[PDB]
Structure 1
Amino acid sequence: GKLWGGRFVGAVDPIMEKFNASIAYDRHLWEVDVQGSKAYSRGLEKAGLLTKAEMDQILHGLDKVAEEWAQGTFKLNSNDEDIHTANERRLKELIGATAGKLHTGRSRNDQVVTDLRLWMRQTCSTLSGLLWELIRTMVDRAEAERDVLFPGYTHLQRAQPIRWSHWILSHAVALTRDSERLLEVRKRINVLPLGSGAIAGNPLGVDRELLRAELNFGAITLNSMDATSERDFVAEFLFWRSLCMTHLSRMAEDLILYCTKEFSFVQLSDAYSTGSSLMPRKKNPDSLELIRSKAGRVFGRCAGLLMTLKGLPSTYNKDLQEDKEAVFEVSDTMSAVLQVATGVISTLQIHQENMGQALSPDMLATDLAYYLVRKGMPFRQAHEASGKAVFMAETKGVALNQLSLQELQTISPLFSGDVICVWDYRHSVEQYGALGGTARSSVDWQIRQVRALLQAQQA
C-alpha cells in the first residue's frame, strides 16, 4: 500500500482474527469432538500407527479432558481458535509426547463435519421426542373433548359446525408429517464422514468400517470430496424446521384469534399469557405471538445457508464455516417452541358455551338440501329448494329453524316430520362419516390412525 490511504494494521489485524474465531460457539462440540477423537485413536491403532500403550495413553488423556469440560474446570485460551485446538492443546499438556500423533492422516475438514453430524444426531433425537410429546398431547386432548362443537371457517367466515377435536387433529396430522420428515433427515445425518482426510481421503489406510462401528454410525460417506464439502444435512434440517414452524405459526394464529373477546372460545393459563394491571379481562397471548415470530427467524437461517452454498467451487472453502451457528440457534429455538406449544395446548381452557353460541341456524341451510338429496332429489333441485326455504323465513322475519313442517311442505312434499333433525348442530356434524370427516366415528378413526403412526415411528 502506502501510495494511498487504507487499513495497514500490520501482519495480523484483530478484526480478521475475532471474525475468524469460532470457539465462542463451536465450544459445544467438545462432547462429540472428544468422543470422535477416541474413535480415530482406536482407528490409528489397528492401522498400526500407534501402540496399544500409545492408544491407551491418548485414549485415557482424552477422558481426563472431557471430565474437565463437564466440571467447568477446563481453562480456555485466548490462544485458542476453536474447540478442536482447545481439546488437543490440553490433551498435549497431559500427555505431551504421543498427543501429537492423534491427528495423523486426519484433517480439520473431515474432523469438524464428523463433530457436527455427531452432535446433530443427538440433538435431532431429543427434538423427535419433544415433537412426539406434542402430538401425543394434542391427540389425547382430542379424545377427551370429542363432544365439544364450534364453528369451522373458510375465508375466516363462519361456515358450518365442526368438532373442536377435528380442529385439533388437523394440526396434529400436519405435525406427524413434520415428525416423518425429521426421521428421514436423521438417517442422512447418521453417515460417518471421518476418514475423508482434507479432500482426497485418509492416506494411511485406517479402517473406515471400524470408525463407523465405534461411533455407531449408520454408514460411511461414499466420496471424500463430497463428505468434506457438502452440507445437505444442515440445509435439510433448516428446511424441516422452517416447514414445522409454518404449521406452528398457523396453530398460533388460530389460538390467538380464538382468545380475542370477539371469539372467546379459548383462554390461556396464566403461565402462558400476560394480563393488564387495570384490566383483568385483558389476557395477551404472548406465548402464541412468540411462537409465530420464530417462523421468520428460522426460515431466514435456512434461506441464508442456501445463499452461502450457492455457486461455491470444489472442494472445501472457508464459506462452509457458516453452518455451526445456524444449526445451534435453530436447534435451541425449536426445542423451546415445541415445549412451549406443548404447555399451551396442554393447559388451555375452552368455553364450550361460547363455542356453541357461535353456531347459527343459517349454517344448516345446506343441511336442509342434503336432507332432500337422501330422499332421492337431485342436488340442484334440493339446493334450489333450500334456497326457497331460506328466502321464506327471511320475508317472515324469522330463523330458518322456525319454519313449520307445513311451511316446509309448501316448498316440497318430500319434507317429512323428521326434518327437525336438521336443526340439531349435533346431527349436522354426524353427516360426515366418510373417513377423514368431522363425524364422531371418523374422529375415533383418526385418533387410532395417528396413535399407530406414532407407534410405527418409535420402532
Structure 2
Amino acid sequence: VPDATRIGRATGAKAPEFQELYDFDAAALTLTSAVFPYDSQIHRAHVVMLTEQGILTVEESATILSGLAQVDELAATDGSLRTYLPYEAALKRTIGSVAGKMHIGRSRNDLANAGKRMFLRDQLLRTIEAVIGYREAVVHKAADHLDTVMVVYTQRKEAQPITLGHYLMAISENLAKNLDRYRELYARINLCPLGAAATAGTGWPLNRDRTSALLGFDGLVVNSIEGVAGWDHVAEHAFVNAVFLSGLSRLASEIQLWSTDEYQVAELDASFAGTSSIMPQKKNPMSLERSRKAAFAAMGPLVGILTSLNAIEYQMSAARVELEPRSIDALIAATHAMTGVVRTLHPNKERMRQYAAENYSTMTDLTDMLVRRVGIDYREAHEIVAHVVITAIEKGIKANKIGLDLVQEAAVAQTGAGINVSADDIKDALDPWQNVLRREGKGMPAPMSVKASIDDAMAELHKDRAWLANATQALANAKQTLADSVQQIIQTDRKYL
C-alpha cells in the first residue's frame, strides 16, 4: 500500500534517511538484546584465555565452546536466555556441569561492563561513520556554493553578507571537533575491564591482556574496582551525543528559518518534507523537527546517567543508568536525515542575494569605508551609518539604493558636517558581493578563503575515514582471530582427543 503520508505537497516517497526517523523507535533493541551477542563473544574469549592458562583443558574448552553456539542459537528466539545466569543454566542443561567452569575467575560485573563497552564501541564507530558522512555532505555541499551570496544572522537578525559555502564550513569545523570528542572517547571506551571479576580481581591466574586482545580492546581498565565501578565513559558517550546533537539541532533550526514562508531563502527537498492532514498548503519541515526532537531527547540519558553516578559510591552498583540502544539509534537517524537534508537542500540563490543587497547587512562595510577613507573613528562612523539606515527604512529605501545624498544628509544630521567620500565609494561598500570578497582572511566568506577551508577539511576527512577504517579493521581482525581459535579448539577435540 502507498505511504499514506505522501499526499498533496508531500510528493514522492520519503527519503530513506527521512524514513529512518520513523522506524528507529519501534525497531530499537533493548540494552539486554543489544549486548547479548557481545556477551557471547566474551564467553568465547574468556574460555579461550582460560584454556591458554591451563585452567580449562582443551577437552573442557571444546565442550563449552560447542555449547555456547547451541545456546546462542536457542537465545536467538528465546529472549529469556540473554542474561547471564539463565544463559549459563541453559548451557549447563545443554552440555552438563562443565558449563559452570566458563565463569571461573569472572563475574557478571566485569562481564557486563565489558559487554556494554563492546556494544558502545561498535555504536561509537557507527556514530563516527555517520558523523563523517554528515561532514562529507556539508563540505561537499559547501564546495558547490562558494558564490552563493547570502546573509549570515546574529540574534536572528541579518548581520553581514557571506556565502552558503562559508556557512556550511562553520558546521564542518563544529563536526571536526565533535569527531575529536568521539575519537577521544573511543580511546576510553575501548579498554577491557575483564579480569576485575566482582571488583577485586581473582586468585585464578588469568591473562587479562589475552582476553582483551581477543576482544579487540586496545588496553585494560587496570584497577579492578575501576573495571566494574567505572562508568564515566557512559556519561561521556551520552554527553558527546548531546553536544553533537545540539549543533545538529542548530543547523536544523537554521534551515527551518531559512525555509519559512517568510524568509524563503531555502527549500527542503520534497523527500525531506511532510504535509498536513488538514492544511493543503503545508510543506512541513518534519525532518528538521524530528531531528531536533532527537537532539532534545539526548539530554535525557546524559542527565539520568550523571544523576545515577552522583547518587552512589565508587562501587559496582545496579542503580547506574545506561546509555540505551534507542538513544543511539535516534542520533543515527537524525544524523542520516540531516545528512540528506544538507545534500538535497535547495537554496533560493536569487532571494538570498536580494536580502543581502537590500536589507542593510552591508552597512558595516559602509562604516569601515568612512573610517578607512576619511579617518574618523569607528564609533562616529557607526553613528552616521545607523542614521543612514534609520532614514533609509523611514523613506523605504533599500540598502542597494542608498546613495551619496542620503549618506551626506545623515552625516550632516549627526555631525553638522559632510563627509568626503564619493558615490563610487558608497556603491562599492554597499555591493554585497564586494562585502564577501573584501572578507578574505582566514575563516572568512571570500571564495578563496572558503576554498582553502574546504581543501583543509577534505584532507581532514581523509584522516577521519582512515582513523575509522583502522579502528574497524582492528575489531574485525580480533573477531576473526577469536573465531579461528574457537574452531581450532572444537575441531582438535573432536578429531584428536
TM-score w.r.t. length of structure 2: 0.79
1:352 and 2:349 equivalent?
yes
- Structure-2 separation of matches of 1:295 and 1:417: 48
2:299 aligns with: 299
1:453 and 2:460 equivalent?
yes
CA 1:100/1:400 → structure 2, altered by over 3 Å: closer, same or farther?
Answer: closer
1:143-292 alignment, distance < 5 Å? 143-276=143-276, 280-292=280-292
Q: Structure 1 counterpart of 2:53, which letter? A: A
Q: Structure 2 counterpart of 1:434, which letter? A: G
The Cα of 1:398 is off from its aligned counterpart by: 4.7
1:341 and 2:338 equivalent?
yes
2:488 aligns with: none
1:45-444 alignment, distance < 5 Å? 45-67=51-73, 72=76, 74-77=77-80, 82-276=82-276, 280-320=280-320, 322-323=321-322, 326-359=323-356, 360=358, 362-375=360-373, 377-380=375-378, 382-383=381-382, 386=385, 398=397, 401-402=400-401, 411-415=418-422, 417=424, 419-444=426-451
- For the Cα contact (< 8 Å) 2:403–2:423, is it kept in 1? no
Q: Structure 2 counterpart of 1:139, which letter? A: V
- For the Cα contact (< 8 Å) 1:267–1:348, is it kept in 2? yes
CA 1:303/1:392 → structure 2, altered by over 3 Å: closer, same or farther?
Answer: closer
Q: Deviations over 1:94-128 (max 9, x none)?
A: 32242121011211111111111111111111111
What is the DSSP-based 3-state SS (H/G/I as helix, E as strand, rest coil) of the residue aligned with 1:55?
helix
- Structure-1 separation of matches of 2:119 and 2:99: 24
CA 1:277/1:352 → structure 2, altered by over 3 Å: closer, same or farther?
Answer: farther
Structure 1 regions of 5+ residues with no counterpart?
A: 1-22
Q: Structure 1 counterpart of 2:434, which letter? A: H
- Structure-2 separation of matches of 1:391 and 1:330: 50
Q: Deviations over 1:203-259 (max 9, x none)?
A: 211111111221121111221112111211111101111111211111111111111
CA 1:442/1:96 → structure 2, altered by over 3 Å: closer, same or farther?
Answer: same
Q: Deviations over 1:73-103 (max 9, x none)?
A: x4344xx5x5223432333333224212101
- For the Cα contact (< 8 Å) 2:273–2:285, is it kept in 1? yes
CA 1:140/1:225 → structure 2, altered by over 3 Å: closer, same or farther?
Answer: same
- For the Cα contact (< 8 Å) 1:221–1:227, is it kept in 2? yes
CA 1:422/1:113 → structure 2, altered by over 3 Å: closer, same or farther?
Answer: same
What is the DSSP-based 3-state SS (H/G/I as helix, E as strand, rest coil) of the residue aligned with 2:458?
helix
CA 1:412/1:112 → structure 2, altered by over 3 Å: closer, same or farther?
Answer: same
CA 1:57/1:423 → structure 2, altered by over 3 Å: closer, same or farther?
Answer: same
- Structure-2 separation of matches of 1:275 and 1:84: 47
TM-score w.r.t. length of structure 1: 0.85
- Structure-1 separation of matches of 2:79 and 2:278: 51
CA 1:397/1:75 → structure 2, altered by over 3 Å: closer, same or farther?
Answer: closer
The Cα of 1:150 is off from its aligned counterpart by: 1.7
- Structure-2 separation of matches of 1:427 and 1:264: 24
CA 1:391/1:64 → structure 2, altered by over 3 Å: closer, same or farther?
Answer: closer
CA 1:411/1:327 → structure 2, altered by over 3 Å: closer, same or farther?
Answer: same
- For the Cα contact (< 8 Å) 1:273–1:286, is it kept in 2? yes
Q: Deviations over 1:50-81 (max 9, x none)?
A: 11121122223323444555xx4x4344xx5x
Overall identity of the aligned pairs, in %:
29
The Cα of 1:276 is off from its aligned counterpart by: 3.8
- For the Cα contact (< 8 Å) 1:235–1:302, is it kept in 2? yes
- Structure-2 separation of matches of 1:257 and 1:331: 27
- Structure-2 separation of matches of 1:395 and 1:283: 35
CA 1:361/1:214 → structure 2, altered by over 3 Å: closer, same or farther?
Answer: closer
Q: Deviations over 1:1-52 (max 9, x none)?
A: xxxxxxxxxxxxxxxxxxxxxx964022221111111111012112222111
CA 1:314/1:366 → structure 2, altered by over 3 Å: closer, same or farther?
Answer: closer
CA 1:169/1:100 → structure 2, altered by over 3 Å: closer, same or farther?
Answer: same
Task: Report the count of equivalent residues.
Answer: 428
What RMSD, in angstroms, separates the aligned Cα atoms of the two structures?
2.6
- Structure-1 separation of matches of 2:427 and 2:249: 41
1:27 and 2:27 equivalent?
no
- For the Cα contact (< 8 Å) 1:181–1:240, is it kept in 2? yes
The Cα of 1:178 is off from its aligned counterpart by: 1.4
The Cα of 1:415 is off from its aligned counterpart by: 2.8
Answer 1 or 2: which has greater helix percent: 2
- Structure-2 separation of matches of 1:406 and 1:262: 32
Q: Deviations over 1:163-222 (max 9, x none)?
A: 111222222221221111011111100111000111210221111111122112111122
CA 1:365/1:341 → structure 2, altered by over 3 Å: closer, same or farther?
Answer: closer
- Structure-2 separation of matches of 1:389 and 1:304: 53
